[PDB]
Amino acid sequence: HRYRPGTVALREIRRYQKSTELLIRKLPFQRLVREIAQDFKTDLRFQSSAVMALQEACEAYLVGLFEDTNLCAIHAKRVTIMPKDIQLARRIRGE
Amino acid sequence: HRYRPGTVALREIRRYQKSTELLIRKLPFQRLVREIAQDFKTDLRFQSSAVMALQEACEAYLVGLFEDTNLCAIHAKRVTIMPKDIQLARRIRGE
Amino acid sequence: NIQGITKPAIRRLARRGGVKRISGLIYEETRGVLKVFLENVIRDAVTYTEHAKRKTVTAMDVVYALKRQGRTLYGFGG
Amino acid sequence: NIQGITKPAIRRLARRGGVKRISGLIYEETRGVLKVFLENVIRDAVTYTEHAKRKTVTAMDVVYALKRQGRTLYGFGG
Amino acid sequence: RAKAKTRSSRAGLQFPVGRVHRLLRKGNYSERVGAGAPVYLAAVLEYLTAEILELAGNAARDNKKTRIIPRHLQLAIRNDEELNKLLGRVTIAQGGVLPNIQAVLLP
Amino acid sequence: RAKAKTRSSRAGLQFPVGRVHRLLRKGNYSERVGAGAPVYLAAVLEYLTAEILELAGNAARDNKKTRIIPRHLQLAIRNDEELNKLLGRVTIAQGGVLPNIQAVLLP
Amino acid sequence: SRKESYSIYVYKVLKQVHPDTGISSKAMGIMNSFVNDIFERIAGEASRLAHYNKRSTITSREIQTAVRLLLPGELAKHAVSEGTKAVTKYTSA
Amino acid sequence: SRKESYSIYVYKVLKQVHPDTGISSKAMGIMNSFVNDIFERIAGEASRLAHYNKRSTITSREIQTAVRLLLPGELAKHAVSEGTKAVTKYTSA
DNA sequence: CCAGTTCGCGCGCCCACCTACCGTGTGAAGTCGTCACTCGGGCTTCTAAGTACGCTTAGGCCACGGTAGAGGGCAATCCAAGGCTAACCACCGTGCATCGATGTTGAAAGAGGCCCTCCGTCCTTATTACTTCAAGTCCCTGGGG
DNA sequence: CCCCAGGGACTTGAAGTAATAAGGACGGAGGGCCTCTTTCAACATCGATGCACGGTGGTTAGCCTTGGATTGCCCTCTACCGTGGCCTAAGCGTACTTAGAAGCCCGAGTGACGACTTCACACGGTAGGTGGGCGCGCGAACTGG
């Protein structure tokens, strides 16, 4: 059995849009947090809930960006998001 | 002598981007303010400087919107802004 | 009175925005957009006016209204 | 460490965003955007910590960093 | 003296009027606080909380659930134009997003 | 008594230290204001005004003008990467815009 | 160290509108952030109104105008009604 | 009624960096709004920072911390340096 | 549609541990009472906000022929997704060692409320020089040939 | 590319008016005093952050086949451009009318404040209810023919 490209993708949207779990791996994300924070001050510790707060904001923020990116993509009569779409979205947001 | 369609357009960009005067006729704007204000409170007066302050904000806001609208149009490999472009700009800004 | 924002006026604003060509349907959209923006700002400015027990909307009231909508205005006394 | 944000993870985030098909260049673009985003928030949260003369970043510090950047977060004490 | 009657009960409110008054006086908002301000402020806050909770409880009920969780709150907030506008730039932790698929992408 | 020496003069500043101090006490920012807070704050505002004004005056000279008008300030703020970021969400009355034409529209 | 919160009051309000519905500890935290947030906005906006009108007292007028400015559309209308009703009852004890 | 402004101080600084350059009344209005605008952010941000630490006094430390949060990139570095230099001289009269 | 299937998913079967209700002390909220004082109200005056009403360009509104940008159709080419595998490490769970979050307490460094004194800054005026408009000249980019 | 040309930039020469330099005033800084207390620092206490290790799968990394998406060519047509004609009223002058912005004076209705008191609230504790893992069969949308 082979689903045609797109069938499973739409299935994933519905599943992932109904669920609420965090989607970035926790450990790799933590190392990144520590790695970025390392450059400002050494021997910096982080409360476990602090790391979770950063992760929640980042995932929520990034999802929001992908939604706006899609609208830009659709505007060009395309269904595939591309880097130029993110750039456009961000420019309009003022970032 | 007849300028080709588009030649004069570039000249207006340079002229109006070099100038700073307000571009909406003052009296029409004043009449607009009074009609809109009527719905909130009757017989409302406005300092002449108050109307000026609104116009400055309004023109700047519209200029900001047309700039972002253009990027959307350019994004779709078009040079003409259309109502669908304005809607997109507004949507991304959150309006 | 909303028509007082004439077609040439909308064109001039677009030119300042770097727009080279304008579709014939843009004029109606812009008028609608302007209506929304003005209502919001005027609403807040009038709201301040009632709070100050005043009958005349001042430029400072508008400035305050603009600040709360994230459109800070410089040049009218603060 | 940025490579820890794997392709499937970036995809899943896009799926939540309603994206149906994704170009292969998005993964590199997303990593860059996230890094910038993270730097700003951590910068502010770390700044708050140093002022308190503390050595451990708390959850409150992060929330405040988000608030001043217009990204109010609910659920972690503010 | 007579039994102490909380200012909240005198005003028929569940939110703590006494607590709100202290927070206003010590919150560096103004020099003086009028006797009605904490009462007025508390009443508005209580009403708004009720509003969200009412919509959130309805969403919870639709999912055959008896406890409101952050997911239910997101549904309630994003589905109400006025609440959404008020809380536009707010992120609900563990909230997810609203099921929304662009029409052009559907089969 | 000794001749009165302004706090502004002791710190080598042009901005009014005393006024800022009073403005902090009457600005509903905190209950108390340290003696070093107003001096530090005054210097920062002075530095920033100098920065903006310095860059704007240069723009004026390039336009062969000797008096600053709103136009020059807009140029200074939008043409400077650092100051532009700080003043992203500000509208300068009578400022106009930066000459910027998309490359795709040029002949 | 005791940490003040609106949890009890949030629970009371919930029990009036949904007697048989509970709320998780996480959701309770959300409400606390919410209450504080709205409080700050109103209190912060109220401060500006008082300062703009050169009045050192914050009264019913400032909150009423603050609510009219911050709350969008009908939320303000109903909220203002609630506040006015509460203050009126309070003034008559 | 006399209305305070930064006009005199703005003019002095201009004459130091550009001795032969003036300023229009309109530009002066812009500068007053700017000074007050930055002032509000700095004073307002320092308050939250002060409030978070349960301190009732806003000191140069909070201003320094508030400045770091608001001024972007190298602006912050130089602004912090200037303030510290000025304050240091001030404590020694 | 026929026909088969993969996915979605609702409905239980427990367990379990997350939360509702209970017991306790207290500190901050309530009440009485004093007293300082803020602003709502009366009254007054001057500003500018509205109004009118004329003029004079200057710009908006309409028509019109055209042209190039927007758009639909077509094909090739190319490149992300579905499915397959081997393998990595995220996470559970436990466990320990130890930093620093966190709390308390002394007293003095600090900032205040008040007071007398002085001059910095603001209102007011008069004078410029820098700006501004008009005209005349010149550079230069533009479009049909 | 050329010829002819249409617009804007540049450069005086007159007005003129907003910059601005200069003088008088007052209330707002500044010095100075005695005073209340916020906070640095000292020392104390334990939670929870860091680190580690052994598994234990679930989940990734990579590749292959792929057919549907992208996009470039092409035509084509019709939706704006630019010029002209022609009329309307916006910009401004000048003037008048007057509504309320702004201010000064006043008191009493108001909130800060202190002393004292008490019970509403939060922390420790207990015992069931809600919901998630385990597990299965039912709802039906999809896709090769």
**3-state secondary structure string, chain B?**
CCCCCCHHHHHHHHHHHHCCCCCCCHHHHHHHHHHHHHCCCCCCEECHHHHHHHHHHHHHHHHHHHHHHHHHHHHCCCCEECHHHHHHHHHHHCC
Q: Can you tell me the distance from the alpha carbon of G70 to that of G50, in angstroms, rounded to the nearest whole number?
A: 15
Chains with 3+ CB–CB pairs under 8 A to B are A, C, F
Q: Can you tell me the distance from the alpha carbon of E64 to that of D14, in angstroms, rounded to the nearest whole number?
A: 29
> Does F42 sit within 8 Å of H86, measured CB to CB?
yes
When CB atoms are compared, the residue of B10, B23, B36 closest to C38 is B36
| H82 interface with C at CB cutoff 8 Å | no
Q: Can you tell me the distance from the alpha carbon of H51 to that of A50, in angstroms, rounded to the nearest whole number?
A: 20
Element holding C57 (H helix, E strand): strand C56-57
- Per the CB < 8 A criterion, the answer to whether F94 and C74 are in contact is no
Taking contacts as CB-CB distances below 8 angstroms, the residues of chain C near G47 are none
At residue F43, φ and ψ (nearest 5 deg) are -60, -40
Q: Can you tell me the distance from the alpha carbon of G52 to that of F66, in angstroms, rounded to the nearest whole number?
A: 36
- State the virtual CA torsion across D78, E27, G1, F33 in degrees, nearest 10: 110
| Distance of alpha carbon C13 from the chain centroid | 13
| Distance of alpha carbon B79 from the chain centroid | 18
Resolution in A: 4.0
Amino acid in position B88: L
Q: Can you tell me the distance from the alpha carbon of D24 to that of D14, in angstroms, rounded to the nearest whole number?
A: 13
Q: Can you tell me the distance from the alpha carbon of D45 to that of D64, in angstroms, rounded to the nearest whole number?
A: 7
- State the virtual CA torsion across B6, B7, B8, B11 in degrees, nearest 10: 120
Chain breaks in chain D (C to N over 2.5 A) after: none
**Residue range of the domain that includes C54:** 1-76
- Per the CB < 8 A criterion, the answer to whether C34 and B24 are in contact is no
> Does B12 sit within 8 Å of C12, measured CB to CB?
yes
Element holding G41 (H helix, E strand): helix G25-52
**3-state class (DSSP) for residue G23:** strand
Which residue ranges make up each domain of chain B?
A: 1-95
Chains with 3+ CB–CB pairs under 8 A to F are B, C, E, H
Angstrom distance, C9 CA to J92 C1': 20
D73 Rama sector, left if φ>0, alpha if ψ -120 to 50, beta otherwise: beta
Bridge-based pairing of strands B45-46 and E32-33 is unpaired
Domain count of the fold of chain C: 1
Q: Can you tell me the distance from the alpha carbon of D45 to that of D42, in angstroms, rounded to the nearest whole number?
A: 5
Amino acid in position B80: T
Here the tokens at position G69 are 């400015």
Of F35, G55, F96, the C-alpha closest to C13 is F96
| Residue F39, domain CATH | 1.10.20.10
Q: Can you tell me the distance from the alpha carbon of B73 to that of A88, in angstroms, rounded to the nearest whole number?
A: 11
Which ranges of D1-78 does DSSP label H, i.e. alpha helix?
7-16, 26-51, 59-68
CATH 3.30.470.20, domain G7-91, yes or no: no
When CB atoms are compared, the residue of C74, C76, C77 closest to H34 is C74
- State the virtual CA torsion across F54, F55, F58, F64 in degrees, nearest 10: -110
Q: Can you tell me the distance from the alpha carbon of E10 to that of B70, in angstroms, rounded to the nearest whole number?
A: 59
| Distance of alpha carbon G19 from the chain centroid | 22
Residue G10: burial class (beta carbons within 10 Å; 0-12, 13-18, 19+): buried
H21 touches strand I (CB under 7 A): no
Q: Can you tell me the distance from the alpha carbon of E41 to that of E38, in angstroms, rounded to the nearest whole number?
A: 5
- Per the CB < 8 A criterion, the answer to whether F81 and F98 are in contact is no
- Per the CB < 8 A criterion, the answer to whether C38 and B32 are in contact is yes
Here the tokens at position C62 are 């508008």
Maximum separation of any 2 CA atoms in chain C, in Å: 48
Q: Can you tell me the distance from the alpha carbon of D50 to that of D46, in angstroms, rounded to the nearest whole number?
A: 6
Q: Can you tell me the distance from the alpha carbon of H32 to that of A77, in angstroms, rounded to the nearest whole number?
A: 49
Which ranges of chain C does DSSP label H, i.e. alpha helix?
7-16, 26-51, 59-68
| Chain I bases closer than 7 A to any CB of the protein | 5-9, 11, 18-20, 28-32, 38-40, 48-50, 59-61, 66-71, 79-83, 89-91, 99-103, 110-112, 117-123, 129-131, 142-144
Q: Where are the beta strands (DSSP E) in E1-107?
A: 32-33, 67-68, 90-92
Q: CA neighbours within 13 Å on the CB side: how many for E4?
A: 2
- The CB density around residue A1, as the number of other CB atoms within 10 Å, is 2
When CB atoms are compared, the residue of F37, F70, F85 closest to H63 is F37
**Residue range of the domain that includes F52:** 4-107
Taking contacts as CB-CB distances below 8 angstroms, the residues of chain F near E31 are 28
DSSP assignment of F22-90, as one string? Answer: HHHHTTTS-SEE-SHHHHHHHHHHHHHHHHHHHHHHHHHHHTT-SEE-HHHHHHHHHT-HHHHHHTTTE
Q: Can you tell me the distance from the alpha carbon of B67 to that of F79, in angstroms, rounded to the nearest whole number?
A: 17
Q: Can you tell me the distance from the alpha carbon of A48 to that of D45, in angstroms, rounded to the nearest whole number?
A: 14
Length reported for chain A: 95
Q: Can you tell me the distance from the alpha carbon of C12 to that of C6, in angstroms, rounded to the nearest whole number?
A: 10
Length reported for chain C: 78
- G6 to B31, D13, E40, E52, G39: CA distances (angstroms): 49, 34, 17, 15, 12
**3-state class (DSSP) for residue G57:** strand
Secondary structure of chain H in HEC code, one letter for each residue: CCCCCCHHHHHHHHHHHCCCCEECHHHHHHHHHHHHHHHHHHHHHHHHHHHHCCCCEECHHHHHHHHHHHCCCHHHHHHHHHHHHHHHHHHCC
Q: Can you tell me the distance from the alpha carbon of F6 to that of F18, in angstroms, rounded to the nearest whole number?
A: 8
| Chain J bases closer than 7 A to any CB of the protein | 5-9, 18-20, 27-32, 38-39, 48-50, 59-61, 67-71, 79-83, 89-92, 99-103, 110-112, 117-123, 129-131, 142-144
- State the virtual CA torsion across H75, H79, H82, H86 in degrees, nearest 10: 170
| Distance of alpha carbon A90 from the chain centroid | 14
Here the tokens at position G48 are 């500006």
A79 touches strand J (CB under 7 A): yes
> Which of the 50-69 residues on chain A come under 7 Å of nucleic strand J at their beta carbon?
none
Which ranges of E63-95 does DSSP label H, i.e. alpha helix?
70-78, 81-86
Cα angle B32, B36, B39 (rounded to 5 degrees) comes to 155
| B73 interface with A at CB cutoff 8 Å | no
At residue G91, φ and ψ (nearest 5 deg) are -65, -25
CATH 3.40.50.150, domain H25-91, yes or no: no
DSSP C52: T
Cα angle G20, G24, G28 (rounded to 5 degrees) comes to 105
DSSP E89: T
Q: By CA distance, what is D60's nearest residue in G?
A: G33
- State the virtual CA torsion across G44, G48, G53, G57 in degrees, nearest 10: 30
Q: CA neighbours within 13 Å on the CB side: how many for H86?
A: 30
Q: Can you tell me the distance from the alpha carbon of B7 to that of B18, in angstroms, rounded to the nearest whole number?
A: 17
Bridge-based pairing of strands G57-58 and D56-57 is unpaired
Tell which CATH classification among 1.10.20.10, 3.30.70.260, 3.40.50.1860, 1.20.1200.10 matches the domain B1-95.
1.10.20.10
Q: Can you tell me the distance from the alpha carbon of B45 to that of B32, in angstroms, rounded to the nearest whole number?
A: 13
- The CB density around residue D48, as the number of other CB atoms within 10 Å, is 26
